[PDB]
């Protein structure tokens, strides 16, 4: 399972999309997810993390 | 004059080799509570020549990742700044930790710190004066200065206090320092206060007490808030007193202005009554007068940025920080 940040922000405004971004940061800190960004300003991919064994679809 | 990116290798929690940016004209640095964000404040101060004692360590070597617990990740670490300039090639300024001592480099030329500082000075960056930096709580410190110490700050900036000893042992020079600095600050202060508080029914005035011997007496500062009558700044209350202090601080930095401005949690001192206002001011200024790099806690501030650099921690023996980049300009404006 994986989640694209840019796809989660598809139909958002500036304040909403910033909050989805900030939430990847928080979730990463809690080790609910792992994070990949191939190069600056590319899409950011969330992958399952150690301290959460459910659905990424659930988390968001 | 543009800070294009920062490159870090094994500096504090920034383990390994990491690119920070590229920056836009208005970039905000954000993330959950941790040392990650302030360590990046420290990296900027470091590549701009800051003394070890202001970098929260006792020894240079301790800035190497892992070194505080005697588990250093490498024998060296560095911070590099890429400075870009239209019509010219990029210029890279690096400070490298080698042999427990700083090695300064400009485009792979090892240089003495004195030449490093001169070359930055030609770019408008004053690394002793730190014209590019607004440190945490700088707004509060400004807000609580009586006219005599408002002068004390000005002679610090204007080098009037430099000449203080040979003068008072006896003088045209000490005046030129103050007023060329002061009148510059006073020239711009009325427009900046009119811009922070959005309506033009605002006014702010900067007058010396000793109009032709100002280095001696205090400096008066009188405002005109909208829903108020003309009264000095000392007789202001909180929410609007802060906006008056911001105008003073920004006007100070608009004399000998740096090409970029690093604001370290300036939105800490802001309410829902003015945070959106100050944030639009920074946005408008970043299109022309200076590049803004802000470290911010409040969504109502950093959603005005064009770019977000978001800091996050990785698990390790030591705190590890990494960054993500996010473009906000692709999305519709909110309210």
UniProtKB/Swiss-Prot annotation, chain A:
The modification Phosphothreonine is found at residue 47. It comes from the Eukaryota. It is found in: Cytoplasm, Cytosol; Nucleus. May promote apoptosis. This is 64-kDa C-terminal product. The gene is RAD21.
